[model samples]
Target: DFEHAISDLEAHNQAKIGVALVSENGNLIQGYRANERFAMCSTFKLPLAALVLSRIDAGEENPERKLHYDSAFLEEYAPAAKRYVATGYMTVTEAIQSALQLSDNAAANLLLKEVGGPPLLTKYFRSLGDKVSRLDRIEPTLNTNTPGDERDTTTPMSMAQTVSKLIFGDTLTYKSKGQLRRLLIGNQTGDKTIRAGLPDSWVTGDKTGSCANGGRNDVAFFITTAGKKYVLSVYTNAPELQGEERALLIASVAKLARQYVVH
Candidate 1:
């Protein structure tokens, strides 16, 4: 199975890794430290974008609201997207799309603020039946990833399950899920990780993340040419490993996933 390969990769890189792949056709599932801890890093943006979209869907948030440009926001989120950047304001919906797709820190921070910060984001995951995911701090600060600190930590299984719930489960309204789909599938990052692992012709959805703790992660969901769908989550933490090795660890795992589902 792919589990041994994942273990070998972790050993070679001196990394602690967690991986999970769930197939839609037969409910096939595989895991390696699926419940272990790893800094959540930017992958948390997926849920951040999800909750903002849900709020908008429920009429609790206005996607049209604008925010003046500021450093507090990085990527894009529901609110930060409204900022014109060069010289004006932006909307919440645009912010979410930008943050999720580009992994913008400023945009995410703005969206995080809009969502009531770390505690609220964590609770949203809890509500989604994920007990292992937690968001404890804002970006840059969160990325510090102090050793032995569980702050901003999540498991591959929890992320896979939560992402599935957010996208396919009954959590968000149709329109909201559609927005989320755009962000995930239209993602512009992850070239060195999961995205690199898949075929370009097989365009799919995935969100990637990294941090100061040497965390390189991706949660992917997509269908092949035959309409077969699979969800793969890989989270890695290797303080001793360099960026290249960390990126390869994720890419190798994803390549295995592609083989498992398609070949």
Candidate 2:
């Protein structure tokens, strides 16, 4: 039934879409090309946040610790950073908030550099047994125009698993987990994607990603009215699909998933 829903979704869209859904117990409920990887874009911020939180839990970093913002280090597409003056200060908590809630590229890069760059994050994911996702670079480096270019990438299944682990696994302390969860629920972007399809009774904690060419993605935890929980991750690439069209495709998939998994 779920597979049919997925097929119907694909039939109506031009983008190459991938999806994965898992139950609260980590059972795969549906997977359509879930193993296929695509450019992750801002979606990598979720795991990056997790890695930073891991350091905080180990007492190696402090969420309250402040870092100076240097304009020279700023990258393109930092909406929050653009609002600030030449130089300012941001604590680790604020940085995490900007990165997750606002999808701020500069804020994410600052935190990534502090945590020892993309390699360390990749290693951390591998340590968690992630086999298909890769965090290889900082933000603003990948665009839709260069679809062939290698960039930070992940499969729908890998991302769903990561989100599931963040909520259900013991990899991070309770405080860190709570912080990440809150930020995701407060995400300021992708209003038209996964969130657009849900009823008011449902709630979601999610992260979104997009690029100049055609990459659009969302990874999230869906909690139904009946307390049923599922992890849903979707990634799409269609150079012709941008903005609302891309987002609506994801929303349609989510809506169908809700119809099957909830009602």
Candidate 3:
């Protein structure tokens, strides 16, 4: 029955897609080309959140610690200013919240910088046994004429595993785990991607990213009434579609996840 769903997805003419679903106990529940690598975009925030929280739990940093919004985080790392002409300030928690909740580029950039940049962030993810996670650096503004780099990437499997670790309290400390869960709960983006097909009563927190001409990616944590949990990750380089149609496509995939999980 679900076979038709695959055909429908193929009809969208998306290029290079991947997806993975994992149970609360870290079992792989469903998968489709999960090994494929895609630009993670804001999904990178999940790890950044964990890393920052881990440091806090280890007495390395503080969650409420504040950082001044500076030029490096503004112009060099975050390209939000390129997308829209503006300038502003944000705190560490606000940065994380905006980054996850609004997919705010500047907020993410500042948080990434505060968390020791991509080199240290990537190393931290690897230390947690998230083998497929990689975040090299923040991108410049969208309107800027900047070159692309290869340092950032994540496979569907890796993304799902990271979520699983957070939910299961395995890879991160309990303090870090609690913070990561809250961050996921507070995520305000990607409703259509991972929450589209689920009941309204279901709890989900997710983040999303789509480049103007490049790709779309989403990662989500879902909790059921039965107390079961699921992690879903989906990504594609569908450069042709925009706006609602793009969102609808994400909803279609999310629908499939719900059907599979409930049955």
Question: Which portions of model 2 miss their true places by more than 4 Å?
Answer: 85-87, 143-150
Alpha-carbon TM-score of each model against the true structure = 0.89, 0.93, 0.84
Model 3 misses residue 210 by how many Å? 1.4
Query: Better model by TM-score, 2 or 3?
Result: 2
The TM-score of candidate 1 is 0.89
Best by TM-score: 2
lDDT score for residue 86 of model 3: 37
Task: Compose the digit string of candidate 1's lDDT tens values, residues 88-148.
Answer: 5557876787778877777787788889999999999889888899999887678776778
lDDT tens digits, residue span 122-195, model 3: 89878877887787667543322122544577788888887777667576777667766777776666667667
How do the residues 1-263 of candidate 2 rate in per-residue lDDT, one tens digit apiece?
77777776676676678888888756678888888878888888999999989999999998888777777767777877766525576788888999999999888987898789988988987888787777776776744425565557788888888778887678989988888888888898967889888876777888998866677889888788888888889888766765788888999888876765864
In order, candidate lDDTs are 0.79, 0.81, 0.70
**Candidate 1 total steric clashes:** 21
Superior by lDDT: candidate 1 or candidate 3: 1
Model 1: residues with Cα > 4 Å off, grouped in runs: 24-28, 69-88
Note each model's CA RMSD in angstroms: 3.1, 1.9, 3.9
The top-ranked prediction according to lDDT is 2
